[PDB]
Amino acid sequence: QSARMVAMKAATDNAGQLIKDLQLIYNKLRQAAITQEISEIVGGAAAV
Amino acid sequence: SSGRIIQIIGAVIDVEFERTSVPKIYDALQVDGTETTLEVQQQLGDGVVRTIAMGSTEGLKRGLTVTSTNAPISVPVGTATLGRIMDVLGRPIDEAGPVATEERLPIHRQAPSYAEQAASTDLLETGIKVIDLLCPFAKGGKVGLFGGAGVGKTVNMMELINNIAKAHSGLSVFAGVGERTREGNDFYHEMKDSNVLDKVAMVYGQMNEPPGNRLRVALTGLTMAEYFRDEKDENGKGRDVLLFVDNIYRYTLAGTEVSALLGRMPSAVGYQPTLAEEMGVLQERITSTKSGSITSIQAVYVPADDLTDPSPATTFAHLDATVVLSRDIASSGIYPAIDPLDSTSRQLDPLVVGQEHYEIARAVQNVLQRYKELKDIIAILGMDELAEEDKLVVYRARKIQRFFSQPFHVAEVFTGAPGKLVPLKETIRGFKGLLAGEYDHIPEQAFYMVGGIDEVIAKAEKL
Amino acid sequence: SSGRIIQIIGAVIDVEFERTSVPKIYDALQVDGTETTLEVQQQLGDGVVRTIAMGSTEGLKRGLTVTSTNAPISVPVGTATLGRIMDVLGRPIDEAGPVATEERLPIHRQAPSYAEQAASTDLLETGIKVIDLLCPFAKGGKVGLFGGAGVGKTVNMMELINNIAKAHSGLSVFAGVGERTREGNDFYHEMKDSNVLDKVAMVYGQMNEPPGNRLRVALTGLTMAEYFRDEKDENGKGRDVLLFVDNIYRYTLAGTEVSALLGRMPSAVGYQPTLAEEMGVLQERITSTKSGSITSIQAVYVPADDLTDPSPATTFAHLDATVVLSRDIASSGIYPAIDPLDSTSRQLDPLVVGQEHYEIARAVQNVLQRYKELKDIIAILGMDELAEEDKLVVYRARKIQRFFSQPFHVAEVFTGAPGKLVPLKETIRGFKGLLAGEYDHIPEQAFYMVGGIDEVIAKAEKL
Amino acid sequence: MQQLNPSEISALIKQRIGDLDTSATAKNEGTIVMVSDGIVRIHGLADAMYGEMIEFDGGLFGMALNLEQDSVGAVVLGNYLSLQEGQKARCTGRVLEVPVGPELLGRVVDALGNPIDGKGPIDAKLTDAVEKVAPGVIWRQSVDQPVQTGYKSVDTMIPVGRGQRELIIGDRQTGKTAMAIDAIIAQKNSGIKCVYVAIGQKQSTIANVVRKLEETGAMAYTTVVAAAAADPAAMQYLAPYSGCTMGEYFRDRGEDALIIYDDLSKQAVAYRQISLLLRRPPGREAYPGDVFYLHSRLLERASRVSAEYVEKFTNGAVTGKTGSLTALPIIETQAGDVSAFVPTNVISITDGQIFLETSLFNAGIRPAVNAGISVSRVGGSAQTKIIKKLSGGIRTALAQYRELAAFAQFASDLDEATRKQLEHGQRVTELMKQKQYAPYSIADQAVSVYASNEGYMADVEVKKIVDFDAALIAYFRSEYAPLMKQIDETGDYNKDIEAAIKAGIESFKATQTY
Ligand SMILES: Nc1ncnc2c1ncn2[C@@H]1O[C@H](COP(=O)(O)OP(=O)(O)OP(=O)(O)O)[C@@H](O)[C@H]1O
Ligand SMILES: Nc1ncnc2c1ncn2[C@@H]1O[C@H](COP(=O)(O)OP(=O)(O)O)[C@@H](O)[C@H]1O
Ligand SMILES: [Mg+2]
Ligand SMILES: [Mg+2]
Fold first, then answer.
1. Contact (CB, 8 A) for C409 and C159
2. How open is the CA angle D499-D439-D452, to the nearest 5 degrees?
3. Which cysteines share a disulfide bond (chain A)?
């Protein structure tokens, strides 16, 4: 029982650290995508 | 009088005219050298106009004479249209000789008024157990047929048109909207085998015709069906006509491409900025009235399997029902391959289908999602350590999935190709009996490749 | 005849010319005031064209006079250019007097014909375990060091030059392209310590230089090598040509720098659209032909350490020998930090590499692949809660990683440990012995930062 | 405010001040105006066509695609470096026609059909315009005529037949060209025609490919066009159309043919660059939207057609045969991002697709086809009766394997039917690898998979099953050579067939004890 609690606590810790990882990933990827379509728009508007 | 070419850019055509007389939008423009034709897009002042060519671009030099028509395109409609395959210009392309009737009507028209709309909602049914159970429809509906990667959806649409033809003279026509040719060719072949041409006419957008042609074949078929339903016969009564679209997404993409060259910025995502207007124009022009019912089925393929781009959302803004499939269940030896968990019909209500039908659907879906939530324990622990609780549910889910089997009257030929179309009453009776566990003592194979409870029980006696 | 300056933007210039005299697209244009020179790029027409400058853009006003040479950029060529340090103009920077020979050659030329390529089928042993194992070389091939900023693109090259230089005997050329001056000068002095200094020639086009200078910098050295390959030995042919590229990414970057000022459009990221064709033009004049053999090494900086960037992607279409670096491997302190997986070689042929080489390599990659896959779960779960064979393979792969870690003969500069040169036989035997598990009882530390397997034995028994 | 036009040279202006007549010598020849990057603007020749060929004072050729109000933009075909303004050009009254005919089997030439082998001028008697419309649906025929690839999964899980549309997509160094030329290898006995299109690569690649073909002697019924990377983007943009014209030549003679592409993606990028230079509006990813239309209109040329069109082309000279022609486009993945615009467009077109995975090839698989996703919407209707019959069992075995693979990380907790499915599926995963340049007969993979279904692999260690199979093959080669002769002859299936096969399978076990 004790060792199961320890292992599950460790699983919780791993999940939390990965969670932080995923927020950072989402933030950067969203920024990059947004900037990308902005670039497309500004390129397009320059045409006509 | 007449105009001359002043600029050619891809599909964009520009012609000068006398300011005394300038053709108006959507009117026909006859090339005086060839049979290629044009329509009006933007009146550019001083006799200048931006236009698009209905046919190949080759053969055209600046300052070349082109005559006007002062009228949009009127393409022929009538009984003579049946069994005829013609261009976007309403001219026979199937080598079936010249058309017969002169009843031709301008392609572009208005939107139906609010008052004139049909004020009710009558159930539309297929006779197929899985569909009518999960996606019942309303006479005048519009259903999306998503994806397609395990078997030909065309088989299913042919089944539907079998249902319609054997059902009524409520007409139906499919239009090739970005169809890859083999579909249309073979399709045609089984059509003339079934000899259903006396109920259908045909047009192809072939990904090769000018984008305007492939963009306006939609309006072409729309107008044809519009008349044909609105053609009241012997009763002051119109039929219930169904139309089929190879892919509206092809139309959307075509319009998206063409929009920019008009000097128009694209949508935010890059699509045509005018997708919604034209799309909804189509949709409201697809509506049952007090004069017959207008309904359509649209085989849609989601780009990149993402539903967040504007096009699928716009479809949902009109999708009366959503039918998705899976290659896996098709590989499960299942004819429909219908998604019983992510295909829905808006008209799925204890009123429109009745409370009993609604709740039976509820019960079936609950059994199925219980099975899927069971699959984890099923795989991990096996089948034994789980007590008989929910094991009857597993049996029910499996025998329901196998019960989903309707031998199609055209099915790649495994069961003699029969048309089941068992009445919904028998279907619901059998399904509720299965949910109850009345025949939970009978193998799923008894439900496999069979229709009614008579069929299931006779199969169980056989196996 | 002469021209006059009419506009100045950045580093791109435009000039007025007499209707009679419009120089060809590639000519030297001397500033009639200074030493500054110009190359034509665009025929802007109407007696006016566009050009760039080589050297400082300052001290330049409008209306000032410029002549034409009626000759493109043709630079001194021949062995009298060896052991010398030239500018982008091929002029001495070492201040060792003007070059001796008088032969000139235009920097521009078409690619050699298809009927002239050669089958570079000659291997090479270097002494670096990962390289000679995973990337067999063809004497005459293209060798690129895919890597980010500070991954060891220069170091990996210096050590190879050491080994390659000492293992070779004949022609060799270097061309500094847009890099730190300090490293270049240090390399020059190191070469001066050697004596093949004579055998080689120096030219530096560095980051400090204006982008106009930064652009057509490789042309010089590549043309040099092309000559020397075509420069046939009496009663013989050209010699083995040693070529070394220093961040062609700099050339790409300059092309990006100039495109907008060129009236050009912005690629999907912002590059010049013409980047692909210019890269191909560049690469195609680089080949070992029926005449002579040309061995080329490429420094490949990777922007933001991304592969999916257009430029690396195009680059793979050019490199038979691909070597890629990683940041995380260096983050682990492993020097060098070359990734086993992506770096590949078309010389990896069982009929070429010998059966055992091929199969041992394949097994190694397989082991690493499973280890990388299981990294996720082992990060999530406890390492202990896994199958025993899984854990065994994990330790195997980790010891493999360590066994790759090698000291290099120039790397002792930041460490002090003496570099190694490991014969391929030792490598093969040691890796096979590891894959045999002959060492599962051996601490993993015994493999870190080592050379041959005997060194591993000594380290382990020491430990 | 309007900006400058490429027509405002004071020379022209003064001419207009002088006179307003003699319009460009009746537009018979223009004059150079703007020159940059293979793109030239010219004044005059308003009579010419979009797509009309143009001669030049340099004795060169080019293709204008922009008929402005008063100017025309044109692209070079060869090297434009030898040009200057003030020169002139003339309309040829014609569009590109490339030589057509079966005089090039074992011959490689340029995008304009020019001898690059250096084996003398190519003999030619017939030419066709490069741009041609697709035939009419009235002229088609249902596709059921088989095609072979010699691959375990492919020739079984992904049927290929004459006239279809199939994509192979993957990353660099995955076997893209390995499979294509392998099919070319597969045609050695099929006795049909096939042609390859080079697309913007290094010549050395082409030379090595050609050398391997000659090693196989495949470049005896074969023709290939070269579009090197250094080549002008014009040729690199056009050549595939010329190849399709080549193929259609034979299809209009009612013979079986194949055309193969090398990453049309490069071609698309080049075209985007070009069209950009036309000052044309850039859409998503800067591509003009028409790119889909441009590709599709090229790809629909491939088909299987009615015999009726055959005789009408021959004027009834030949009628017993039917025209067909198949193709394989090639697209690269970018980190396998299938949602990428261009390949997404491609998918909307083909009859199916083939996916490869790098984590399979590095695992030693070649080609490591991703069977999980790759499909052939045509179906086994173009596959032989026997192979189509055997297909379903393997299909469902792999289905089960991939389905239960979620918990495959530990086989210690499941029931034992799961273990049986695991072992059978992993064994079927085995037997899938294949060496390159090895034209596996239908008999080969047929008996292999049959023995698989007969547990005859379910009784031998998976590590050796490859040697198992190779032995089985050679064993049969020694003994049952007439049997496999019949097998690869027919493609049907019978019960004496199965008995002798099974008897033969027993014999190998009895004769050699694998
Ligand atoms: N069945 C096979 N067995 C072993 N090796 C194979 C097999 N098929 C292909 N290969 C190898 O794959 C290597 C790389 O693939 P290949 O060069 O044939 O074409 P590709 O996938 O288009 O890659 P690229 O053009 O980028 O180099 C080749 O050197 C070839 O020997
Ligand atoms: N062979 C090596 N082994 C260990 N550390 C090294 C090695 N080479 C370089 N380092 C360190 O890594 C740094 C980066 O090397 P370098 O080749 O100059 O990178 P860049 O790609 O930016 O030119 C070096 O300055 C040195 O400190
Ligand atoms: Mg660096
Ligand atoms: Mg390739």
1. yes
2. 35
3. none
Structure tokens at B54: 């209905």
Bridge partners (DSSP) of residue C245 are C298
**Statement: D98-390 belongs to CATH 3.40.50.300:** yes
Provide the CB-side half-sphere exposure for D14 (13 A, CA). 4
CB under 5 Å of ion ligand 4: residues: D 176-177
Q: Specify the length of chain D in residues.
A: 514
Task: Mark whether C179 is an active-site residue.
Answer: yes
Strands D193-197, D222-226: pairing kind: parallel
The set of long-range contacts for B351-354, using a CB threshold of 8 Å and a minimum separation of 24, is B352/B121, B352/B123, B352/B136, B352/B138, B353/B123, B353/B136
Chain length of chain A? 48
Say whether the C–D interface has 3 or more Cβ pairs within 8 Å: yes
Task: Give alpha helix (H) positions in C168-262.
Answer: 181-193, 211-215, 218-230, 248-259
**Token pair recorded at residue C431:** 């890796």
> In this structure, what token pair is assigned to residue B377?
């324990």
Query: B: neighbours with 3+ CB pairs under 8 Å?
Result: A, D
The angle at the Cα of B352, spanning B350 to B353, to the nearest 5 degrees, equals 65
How many of the other CB atoms lie within 10 Å of CB of B291? 16
CA–CA gap between residue A44 and residue A20 (Å, rounded): 37
Q: How many CA atoms lie within 13 A of D320 on its CB side?
A: 0
Ligand 2 probe mutation, C159, C414, C415, C420, most atoms within 8 A of CB: C414
How far is the C-alpha of C67 from the C-alpha of C55, rounded, in Å? 17
Please enumerate in sequence order all residues whose Cβ is within 8 A of that of B454, keeping only pairs 6 or more positions apart, or say none.
none
Among candidates B243, B242, B245, which has minimal Cα distance to B179?
Answer: B245
List the Cα angle C187/C189/C195 in 5-degree steps: 100
What is the identity of the amino acid at B371?
Answer: Y
Domain D3-97 -> CATH class: mainly beta
D84: three-class secondary structure by DSSP: coil
Tokens 């391959």 — which residue?
Answer: B337
Q: How far apart are CA B134 and CA B322, in angstroms?
A: 10
**Domain boundaries for CATH 1.20.150.20 within chain D:** 394-510
The residues pairing with D53 across neighbouring beta strands, listed in sequence order, are: D63
Short-list C238, C263, C267, C240, CA closest to C252: C267
- The amino acid that residue C57 corresponds to is T
Tell me the torsion sign for CA atoms D235, D236, D237, D240.
Answer: positive
Top-level CATH class of D394-510? mainly alpha
Residue intervals of chain D classified under CATH 3.40.50.300 are: 98-390
- Mutation site for D-interface testing, chosen from A36, A38, A39, A40 by largest number of D Cβ within 10 Å: A40
DSSP 8-state symbol, C304: G
List all residues 6 or more positions away from B358 whose beta carbon is below 8 Å from its beta carbon: B348, B349, B350
Residues of C with CB below 8 A from A43's CB? 266
Does the annotation mark B153 as catalytic? yes
Alpha helices (runs of H) in D433-494, residue ranges in sequence order? 442-453, 465-479, 481-490
Q: Where in chain D is the domain with CATH 2.40.30.20?
A: 3-97
Q: Can you list the alpha helix ranges (DSSP code H) found in D262-357?
A: 264-277, 291-299, 307-314, 341-347
**H or E stretch covering D419:** helix D416-429
Give the span between the Cα atoms of D181 and D168, in whole angstroms. 13
- The answer to whether the Cα torsion of D265, D268, D272, D273 is positive or negative is positive
Which two three-digit tokens encode residue D398? 């792999």
Kindly give the residue spans of alpha helices, DSSP state H, lying in B19-152: 129-134
- Name chain A's partners: 3 or more CB pairs within 8 A: B, C, D
Cα atoms found within 13 Å of the Cα of residue C136, Cβ hemisphere only: 18
Q: Which two tokens stand for residue B45?
A: 């002042």
By Cβ distance, the residue of C266, C270, C380 closest to A11 is C380
Residue D285: both structure tokens together: 């990813």
